[PDB]
Design a protein around this nucleic acid. Structure first.
Lengths: 74, 76, 77, 71, 72, 77, 76, 71
DNA sequence: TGACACGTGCCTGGAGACTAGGGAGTAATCCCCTTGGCGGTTAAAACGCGGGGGACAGCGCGTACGTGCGTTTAAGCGGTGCTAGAGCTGTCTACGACCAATTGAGCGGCCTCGGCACCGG
DNA sequence: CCGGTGCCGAGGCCGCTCAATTGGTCGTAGACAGCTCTAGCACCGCTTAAACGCACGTACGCGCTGTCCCCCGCGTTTTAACCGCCAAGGGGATTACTCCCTAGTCTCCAGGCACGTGTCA
């Protein structure tokens, strides 16, 4: 199967419960996954750019923090 | 504690990285940092969607709520 | 254009500044910049409030819609 | 003062924003919102002026001030 | 300011190279604004790269990465 | 050869850089790289503005031409 | 939704595909995906051509306007 | 001829949604040509992706990847 | 080996195409004030060379430090099936609230002048 | 050691949108069955959080090398600004055209869906 299916339904439900959501339509889960997938892709793309500038083969914690820092935080 | 598992999340992150550049090794504190940021983002998105739902006469969240929240946020 | 009238806007700007501080000088090209920015901000806010109103199965926009827009933008309100 | 932002002016802005029907209580609400916005922007503008100590606010200074207030 | 160092004959020369035969007086201010914005964006990214490497001298590679990451 | 002088360009570049972080020193090949890229961008923009002007049954370029070119290209204007 | 009829579009897409490769089959959601993308592309192009037309004295859009829009976009 | 199945009123409706008030008669042939080129290019790439994967069934992901990589 | 995909077929109501039509945008033309283009010229910012000097980029190299596969398990979280029960909604009655339209007016703006504040040439 | 601009304050004729008023039409608040779908409970399952063994690629810090960027002297030097004469041109108005949106009538086919047949990972 696909890796996107590894973020299971009960995990997203738990996140929503912590977010104060009481009832969830069945179609929310697939919708949430798409939004999440886009976010991760974008962030990691920047992270690898930083890695290449340092001429390294190991993505470091600092690479990720800078990527997150640069993309608009709101 | 984290509300999303570690190993499936890591596998997804590594899969996506494989398409941008082959033969890359991550770091543990790097993936946990990325995961904390991602989960914080989703929790926040879930707050606003819920706020949009409560605004409406309905009581449950709908796909149109997520899409409304993101347009007004200015992300999409 | 669709801009707000200069003199009442200027009077308000001078009045509010007088409350913030005393004896400051404000030039003409400074106020027009502030006015273009203010009207652009208000028009955009009215666009988003209308989108929230239409979302609520209504046609008339309400004060509570504006308050939602300011809440979701992350502004202190 | 705040009453110089007349009801038909706010209506015109809303028409340009695509609004077809407008609640009567919006206008007073809009005025309050506007006042808060103006106060905040001007507070920063004067801060920049004092840092320069020129005591005359430069038009370019305001544009940068306005930009940073927005983003 | 230094934005005024982009003189009128230089912008005219660029326009001549671009095939422009006649140029309105208002072009110059418009061109300057566009140019300034471009410079700001690129340099902002350039300095970010410089800071990541913990160096104090902006390198040619910093600029190339900034330019690459700023699409047309 | 380059159509814009190095030193006024360099001074502007240093001024903008000075607001992000102080005490930064620039490299020669870095400024020349920025200048080649900048002039190439402007020359191309001048081509597109001119193409829009000629399209409009005119002879010279207007401010509205630059603003139109940037909107159709995909920039924010 | 979609602004072009399903069956004639499908017939056209399969005909064109036949010249690239022989004996191929397409899924339904694949064709629906192509139509959303195609219609979004054409509507946006029609938006920009109209903007170019309005820039000119004529309110009416012309064939030469589309070619300018496509040239300025960098497609050809 | 399958290009003729994209009827004149359908393109007009798309154009109406695009905000145009008046439409020249020559647009239709021009629009058809542009559409054909677009389709050819996209499908050409889609099949290319399919062949690289050594598959015989064009998948939804192949099209999505083709569209993404074509801007 | 099994569930999705392709080729035929009935029938209707929504959709496509042609023709009569007419007026409003499009196209050619002219004046005219507006405004870039060339030229003369001089003075003020610039380019290249070298003293001269040191913070700093880049390379060599040693080390340990986390990276990754591998193996055991086990139990806690995840998928599936049945269920009682909470939840979205269209038009019902009807109620008020903004939209349309008319008038006197008072502040918005232009034309003009006396006068102060101040960093700067 | 004075100054030029720019705002402050005032006076003034015009002038048009705004507050006030009345007439009027439609939209939202509540519900209630019609119908829906979702969390909870019980069974069964499977895979990962751990966890050292094992082998190890390399990130990072210290030291050596050089190296080039900064600052000033400089001089001559080359071109950018200001202004007047010259001529190219954008635009509003006038006049003539033609074709594209409305609308009616004739025609036409896309899909539910039902059936049958086929295939590749």
């Amino acid at each position: 199967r696909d890796n996107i299916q590894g973020i299971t339904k009960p995990a997203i439900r738990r996140l929503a419960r912590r977010g104060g959501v009481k009832r969830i339509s069945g179609l929310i889960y697939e919708e949430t996954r798409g939004v999440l997938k886009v976010f991760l892709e974008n962030v990691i793309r920047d992270a690898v750019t930083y890695t290449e500038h340092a001429k390294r083969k190991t993505v470091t914690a600092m690479d990720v923090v800078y990527a997150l820092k640069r993309q608009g935080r709101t | 504690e984290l509300l999303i598992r570690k190993l499936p999340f890591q596998r997804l992150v590594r899969e996506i990285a494989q398409d941008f550049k082959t033969d890359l090794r991550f770091q543990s504190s790097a993936v946990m940092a990325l995961q904390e940021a991602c989960e914080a983002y989703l929790v926040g998105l879930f707050e606003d969607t819920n706020l949009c739902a409560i605004h409406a006469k309905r009581v449950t969240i709908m796909p149109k709520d997520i899409q409304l929240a993101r347009r007004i946020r200015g992300e999409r």
